[model samples]
Target: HHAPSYRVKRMDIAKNDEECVVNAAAPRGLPGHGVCKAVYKKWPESFKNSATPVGTAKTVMCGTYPVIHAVGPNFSNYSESEGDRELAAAYREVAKEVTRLGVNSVAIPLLSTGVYSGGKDRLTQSLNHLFTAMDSTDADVVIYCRDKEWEKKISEAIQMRT
Candidate 1:
């Protein structure tokens, strides 16, 4: 085994503010806005292809650090089973990309729960998939959240559950 420590941290910040932090090779996943729009604007056309389809994940450069753009379900319009599965798969793909690139850290958003309107229950579910995907990996995982309260919940949930 790689024997590297895997931990999860949460930061209360705006949806698009991640560009300011995470200055190294650490990858960040945005759900195509299924990822963040502000950061999405910075990506090139080749990297920003909507044709890439939903529920998929890919890594491309966003200036200095690597960005893993994952396409998630709208949740509002999709079925519960479908949305849940897509959400889970997206995180797994992000982790897959992380290991494929050999990155030591990764930052991801609580997707499907944001504009997609999937609530706290889905939030916990998303966390399970995220922590599971990162289980055997040697990377530090960060959860960038929009609300402060949600950040607290994430911090607690990470301990109580993950």
Candidate 2:
């Protein structure tokens, strides 16, 4: 039998109404970061100060919206192997959490593709890894990119998988 296929959409994670997935470092819990900082500022109580180990996920409700903080690599000059391992773990954790929550849709950012950079073509690699990991899930996977260029690139990549 063919593996189950899920919808992959490109959108802004901050503006999405469905379950939001934020790439985060361990323990900080989305505080003192980019989009996570904004989310923390908006709903402080929604977050808990706990040690979320790398390669795991924490889910909290931000005013009825389930937000998942998938712990990923930090900015301490991560190596290629570390980056790949962290990204794969984060995506796998996210997929597992989505299934557990029974959420129909989840928005995720390209983990470790921001300031960390990771390496050449890291964004493409991470996107492909995450898509493969989540393709079996029934929930729609929404990918949030940095700009229109990356958005178009990722969208084209997703389309090619169909």
Candidate 3:
């Protein structure tokens, strides 16, 4: 097992404005597979044909950071179940990509819970299933959420790890 310590830190929006972006930063030694920016509302086609970003993701690393865009449900329409399904698909897709990169750490923003309004539980449960499927593998899976109650919910969900 990796000696790395995993931490779930809440980015409180009400407390700080810099906490608004959908991102997670991995430490230096960690394979730098890049950030997983989940676009749940509308797909940003400018990125590329693949879910990975061709530009912005690469701009912040040595040359730029890499981005593995995990697409979620359609904009403002999916019901809770539909949203959960979308998130599950995205989660698994990302997990596969992470493995392919030979990386062992991933940071994820709570999927489908923002504009889609699926709420914290919807995302937590969907992620719970994905986490189980992944068997909580080599990577340090971190879920980044800004809202207080939702943050707490995600914390509880992680602690109750499946």
lDDT of 2 by residue, 19-120 (tens): 655545454564655556555665566686534877777787767776777776753556767867877888888888889888777777776666445445
lDDT by residue for model 1 over 57-113, one digit each (tens)?
Answer: 766665665666666676667788887887777777777878887776666776667
Q: After superposing candidate 1 on the true structure, give the runs of residues whose Cα lies further than 4 Å from its correct spot.
A: 1-35, 41-46, 118-121
TM-score top scorer: 2
Q: Which candidate number would show the highest lDDT if scored against the true structure?
A: 2
Residue-wise C-alpha lDDT for candidate 3, range 1-162, written one tens digit per residue: 574323455653112222112222121212222233233112233244333321112112112223454555532566656655655666666666556555555555654455444334455565575565345456666565666787777677667744
RMSD of 3: 9.2
When summed lDDT is taken over every stretch of 10 residues in candidate 3, the lowest stretch is 54-63
Which regions of candidate 2 fall more than 4 Å away from where they truly are? Answer: 1-12, 23-26, 118-121
Candidate 3, which segments miss by more than 4 Å at Cα? 3-6, 12-64, 79-82, 118-121
- TM-scores of the candidates are 0.72, 0.81, 0.59
Error of model 2, residue 141, in angstroms: 1.3
lDDT of each: 0.58, 0.68, 0.45
